Amino acid sequence: AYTTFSQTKNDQLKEPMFFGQPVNVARYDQQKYDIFEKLIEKQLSFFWRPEEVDVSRDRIDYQALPEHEKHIFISNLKYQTLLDSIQGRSPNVALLPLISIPELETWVETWAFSETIHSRSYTHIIRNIVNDPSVVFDDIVTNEQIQKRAEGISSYYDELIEMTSYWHLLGEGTHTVNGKTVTVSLRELKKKLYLCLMSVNALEAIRFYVSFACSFAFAERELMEGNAKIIRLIARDEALHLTGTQHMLNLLRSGADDPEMAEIAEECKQECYDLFVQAAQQEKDWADYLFRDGSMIGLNKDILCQYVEYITNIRMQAVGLDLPFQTRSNPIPWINTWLVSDNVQVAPQ
Amino acid sequence: AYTTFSQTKNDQLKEPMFFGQPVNVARYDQQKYDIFEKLIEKQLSFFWRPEEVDVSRDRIDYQALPEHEKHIFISNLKYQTLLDSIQGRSPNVALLPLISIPELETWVETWAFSETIHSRSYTHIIRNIVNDPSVVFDDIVTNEQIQKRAEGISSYYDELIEMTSYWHLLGEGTHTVNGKTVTVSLRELKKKLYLCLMSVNALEAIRFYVSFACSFAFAERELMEGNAKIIRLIARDEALHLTGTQHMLNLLRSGADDPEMAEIAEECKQECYDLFVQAAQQEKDWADYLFRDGSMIGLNKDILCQYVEYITNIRMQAVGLDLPFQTRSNPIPWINTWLVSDNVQVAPQ
């Protein structure tokens, strides 16, 4: 049921964001939602290449770090690489076959592409600070703590992709597959999508910002400054990405785009709340792993956990969910130095 | 046999440094050895008061330190306080009753006094960086690691003092005390003194310099800068003190002052070698205690142990002993910044 060029001449201004007629002609003279056109333009203006940044000095700083500080830095580096290894391919694979307006389609491709720059930038950093990069890259797959977060995050994508394939192949209804019952419901599929986006919003708006704090904390000590130059650029992008999903989510639940989605979004408003909280807690437990062997000047388990609650409360309200944590001010106000850009608001407000 | 004013009119230019006729008139128009007069003048010009130094910011830095870095800093602080608690009283109590030339007598009093300024300066630092100073001061006595070094160092003083009292009270020979044999030998007493001085030389020329490295390493990170201002002044003094004992030791073994001492110094040249090595090793094991919970930027067990071997080799040659360690250059050349003074060579050469 999916076609790379649907032959029907539809009015793309009146198509839903998702599950409508697949996009035929890619045109940018008009939009249903101009936010996605604005994101594309912003992302394109932000285009950067990793090797523009000298990370040489960072090798010296890294070697001079005490073991536990090495542990902190590299564990964080490995987590980021994992998250954007997923963000590199997944928006394309999971969302493209479902999008039905051109501006959203292009934004997703631009988004995913910008993630591949992020993944490349980690390779730039890793090769430059360790002797054998294979050890690091191999740990990313077999590290028990990292692996746990990978499995959870990738499942929201995988379940959406698999249910999508059934839908394209079988259409809605109840079917017989090798003598088993496979029930295809557009309503269920719409739900898998909504949760996936909520999940991805948490990934980019919370999980990554928790990681940025660890990076900039090094930069505050005037260490790993090349890495921090790069994280600044990544963070500036990340602010575009999370804005993207905040608008998809908010447009979906408002009923403005698709009325059935508004109902579905309320049906699982609890599930999304729970999803977010599970992410916030997983990041708190991650803080535990980072600082198991000790902390450093300016950052520790306690402080980072406060930032998690802080940042979580902000992202959740932005997508119309209830705050799960005590109202708290920013525990690390110095981070906003690093989360700055004259073209987009990187720092959470 | 000791008198605070011996009634004999002796020529103080021809008295031995030690064990001669107790000093009667304190005069400074003439010296046997002008080095001690030069030390006195230098020490007096160096006179400083602890409270001249603002250590306020150091409270903030201390609180911000990770636990293991707190452990490093305070363990080191506690060790210094112990060493100079001993250096405060011991040169006076152990050496005064034995000195027989005025310039040496005054130098020792000036020396011991300057140590009381050091002890006072630690109280200044401690009160300012912790909430309850009693915890710190109480740990200094009951800390198993510190306690070990205290016992060894204080025994060289105590055995000299006790043997001195017998000598003053009984004079040389073989005696009957409560039905026991107490043999008083000036030759033995001269030996207790020589070893004590060797021990004290190690204390000031090695043990304390190992400690200075820990302090300045913090200052290199731009932390605990008030403490480091103070350590700079203490170190400048310490260079005078170790110079004092290097000349007593070297004058004693050269036979220039007392011919019997030259023999005794060769009789136990092995014992002194061993003494020094035991001190160097104890400081290496101390490095282990400091960094048991992790190290910090610029200083760790390995690096500090190299400095111990380095500094030990230098001090030992200065007192005519064989080097126990491989010839090595300075592992922490940055320390010489802090060990500077235009009036005396603080940094080891």
How far is residue B188 from each of residues A248, A267, B20, B174, measured CA to CA in Å? 92, 95, 16, 13
Pair A164, A186: CB distance under 8 Å: no
Q: Which residues of B touch A (CB under 8 A)?
A: 64-69, 223, 293-298, 300
Secondary structure string (H, E, C) spanning A47-87:
CCCHHHCCCHHHHHHHHHCCHHHHHHHHHHHHHHHHHHHHH
Question: Which residues are paired to A206 by β-bridges?
Answer: none
Please count the other Cβ atoms lying within 10 Å of the Cβ belonging to residue A339. 20
Which two structure tokens, joined as six digits, stand for A221? 């000590």
Q: For residues B91 and A324, what is the distance between their CA atoms, to the nearest angstrom? A: 66
Task: Compute the CA torsion angle A9, A11, A16, A18 (nearest 10 deg).
Answer: 40
Contacts for B304 with CB less than 8 Å, ≥ 6 apart: B210, B213, B214, B287, B290, B291
Residues on chain A touching B223 (C-beta within 8 angstroms): 297
Task: DSSP letter for B27, please.
Answer: -
Q: What is the resolution in angstroms?
A: 2.4
Q: What is the residue type of A326?
A: Q
Closest by CA to A298, choosing from A229, A234, A233, A213, is: A213
Which two structure tokens, joined as six digits, stand for A172? 């809605």
CB-based burial label for A17 (10 Å; 0-12, 13-18, 19+): buried
Closest by CA to B48, choosing from B121, B129, B124, B123, is: B121
Handedness of CA A150, A151, A154, A156 (dihedral sign): negative
Residues on chain B touching A69 (C-beta within 8 angstroms): 297
Task: Compute the CA torsion angle B241, B245, B251, B255 (nearest 10 deg).
Answer: 170
Domain ranges in chain B are: 1-349
Pair A13, A32: CB distance under 8 Å: yes
CA distance B306 to chain A (A): 16
Strand A180-184, strand B180-184: pairing: unpaired
Q: Which secondary-structure segment (H or E) carries B54?
A: none
Pair B24, B6: CB distance under 8 Å: yes
Q: For residues B265 and B121, what is the distance between their CA atoms, to the nearest angstrom? A: 36
Contacts for B165 with CB less than 8 Å, ≥ 6 apart: none
Pair A224, A125: CB distance under 8 Å: no
Active-site residue, from A33, A122, A157, A194: A122
- Tell me if B124 is assigned to a ligand binding site: no
How far is residue A18 from each of residues A95, A105, A192, B279, measured CA to CA in Å? 8, 10, 12, 76
Contacts for B290 with CB less than 8 Å, ≥ 6 apart: B71, B72, B75, B76, B214, B301, B304
Pair A261, A255: CB distance under 8 Å: yes
- Tell me if B241 is assigned to a ligand binding site: yes
Residue B310 catalytic? no
Pair B15, B27: CB distance under 8 Å: no
Closest by CA to B279, choosing from B329, B347, B205, is: B205
Question: Which residues are paired to B99 by β-bridges?
Answer: B18
Q: For residues B136 and B115, what is the distance between their CA atoms, to the nearest angstrom? A: 20
Q: Residue B23 phi/psi, 5° resolution?
A: -65, 125
Contacts for A212 with CB less than 8 Å, ≥ 6 apart: A231, A234, A235, A238, A335, A338, A339
B66–A300 CB contact, under 8 Å = yes
Closest by CA to A198, choosing from A145, A114, A128, A275, is: A275
Contacts for A71 with CB less than 8 Å, ≥ 6 apart: A290, A292, A293
Nearest beta carbon to residue A295 from set B66, B297, B298: B66
Which two structure tokens, joined as six digits, stand for B149? 């070094």
Half-sphere exposure of B145 (CA within 13 A, CB side): 14
The architecture (CATH level 2) of B1-349 comes to Orthogonal Bundle (1.10)
A294–B67 CB contact, under 8 Å = yes
Which two structure tokens, joined as six digits, stand for A53? 């940044």
B64–A296 CB contact, under 8 Å = no
Active-site residue, from B62, B79, B122, B310: B122
Please count the other Cβ atoms lying within 10 Å of the Cβ belonging to residue A314. 16
Q: For residues B217 and B11, what is the distance between their CA atoms, to the nearest angstrom? A: 50
Selected residue of B295, B300, B302, B334 to mutate for chain A interface (largest A Cβ count, 10 A) = B295
